[PDB]
Amino acid sequence: ESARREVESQAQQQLERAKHKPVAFAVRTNVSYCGVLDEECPVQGSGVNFEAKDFLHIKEKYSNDWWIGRLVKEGGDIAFIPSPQRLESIRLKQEQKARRSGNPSSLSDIGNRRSPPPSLAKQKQKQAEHVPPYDVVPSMRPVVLVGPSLKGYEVTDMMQKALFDFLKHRFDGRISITRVTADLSLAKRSVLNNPGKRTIIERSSARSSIAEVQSEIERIFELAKSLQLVVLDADTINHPAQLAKTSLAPIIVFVKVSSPKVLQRLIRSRGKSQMKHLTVQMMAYDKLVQCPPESFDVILDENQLEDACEHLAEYLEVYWRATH
Amino acid sequence: DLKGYLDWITQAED
């Protein structure tokens, strides 16, 4: 067929001209698949070998089943991503290769009950949870500081404040510092079509502060869309679990005390107001250290300031170059 | 681990 080869060259010429175009948005995956073995790829031999929890930077539009995108790997190539509707077609192929996919058990029972597949055997049913295969994400995952204790205190707010002095100096003109006043741990997506849409409903959600949350969330989407990082100073997030289920999924930059014994020595050197909060400060520290290592992306446990700055700077420099 | 966690944590504003 001449058409398949002609459209392949036509797509490649479109791919070649797409290396100098602005980035629109990004997507997040949660399932393992190979994009080269699929027969629906517009370009053959240039598929994507992505895995679970992989981020793709979609810039332009191609069709309703494939989207042009780029990975986060250094020196990568422009690839294609199946659409959630297209992913819905390829996921049905996985469960059809087995003996059965619906209700009828095939335990040596053939020829008596044909059992045509009902609606429960398809994706129309099973809508109690309906986890979305693809979650839309900003251009880059935000970087935030978590721990080692309750935010806002003299010991904790001041220590993380010292980091942002170095981050701004090194990354002038490419990152921005923003103070997140509103809460972020209550970012829900599958609660309602538009909770608290109007301020005159006089409802429990409408009159509360839930409405303000979405304004800050959309502010993050816009600022991150400009291909620039975001620096946040929210004082209501103390554990990584409060953002793992969130569709934002920021990078967890971990700062920790080397030993719990020396941690309480820090509080005793500040002032009488701090030892009053030392009782609750220690309780949060223990609940944070035993978090799984895979929940942390950046670590900062050195006792020296210089090694603390360059550990984050190297990762930021790598991430900045990663998207290009 | 205390000497670093006493100056760096304090050199910012104090």
Query: Closest residue of B to A264, CA-based?
Result: B2
User: Measured between CB atoms, which of A259, A269, A304 is closest to B4?
Assistant: A304
Phi, psi (deg, nearest 5) at residue A26: -150, 165
Contact A230, A221 (CB under 8 A): no
The tokens describing A30, both together, are 């949660």
Chain-chain contact of A158 with B10 (C-beta, under 8 angstroms): yes
SS (H, E, C) A296-316: CCEEECCCCHHHHHHHHHHHH
Could you give the maximum distance between any two Cα atoms of chain A, in Å?
A: 82
Nearest-angstrom CA–CA distance, A281 and A15:
54
Say if A318 is an interface residue toward chain B (CB within 8 Å): no
User: Strand A175-178 to strand A66-70: parallel, antiparallel, or no bridges (unpaired)?
Assistant: unpaired
d(CA A112, CA A316): 64
| Cβ <8 Å between B4 and A303 | yes
Q: Which DSSP category does A208 fall into?
A: S
Measure CB to CB from residue A158 to each of B1, B2, B9 and give the nearest one. B9
Give me the amino acid identity at A200.
Answer: I
Q: What Rg do the C-alpha atoms of chain A give, in angstroms?
A: 25
Chain A partners within 8 Å of B9 (Cβ): 155, 158-159, 162, 266
The one-letter code for the residue type at A29 is T
Rounded to whole angstroms, the Cα distance separating A45 from A13 reads 15
* Chain B contact present for A304, CB below 8 A: yes
Q: Do B4 and A162 touch (CB under 8 A)?
A: no
Contacts of B6 in chain A (CB under 8 A): 266, 269
Chain B, nearest residue to A302 by Cα = B1
A158 touches chain B (CB under 8 A): yes
Buried b (16+ CB within 10 A) or exposed e, A154-164: bbbebbbebbb
Residue A67 phi/psi, 5° resolution?
A: -130, 135
Q: Do B11 and A165 touch (CB under 8 A)?
A: no
Q: E strands of A124-259, at which residues?
A: 135-137, 143-146, 175-178, 229-232, 251-255
Q: Does A283 touch chain B (CB under 8 A)?
A: no
Order of all β-strands in the sheet with A55-58: A78-82, A66-70, A55-58, A26-28, A135-137
At B10, is the secondary structure helix, strand, or coil? coil
Q: Which of residues 1-14 of B touch A (CB under 8 A)?
A: 1-13
CB contact under 8 A, A158 and B13: yes
For CA atoms A178, A221, A23, A294, give the dihedral sign.
Answer: positive
Experimental method: cryo-EM
What is the C-alpha separation between A105 and A238, in angstroms, rounded? 48
Short-list A306, A288, A316, CA closest to A147: A288
The 3-state DSSP class for residue A205 equals helix
Residue A252 β-bridge partners: A144
Resolution (A): 3.3
- Considering CB atoms only, which of B9, B12, B13 is closest to A266? B9
The length of chain B is 14
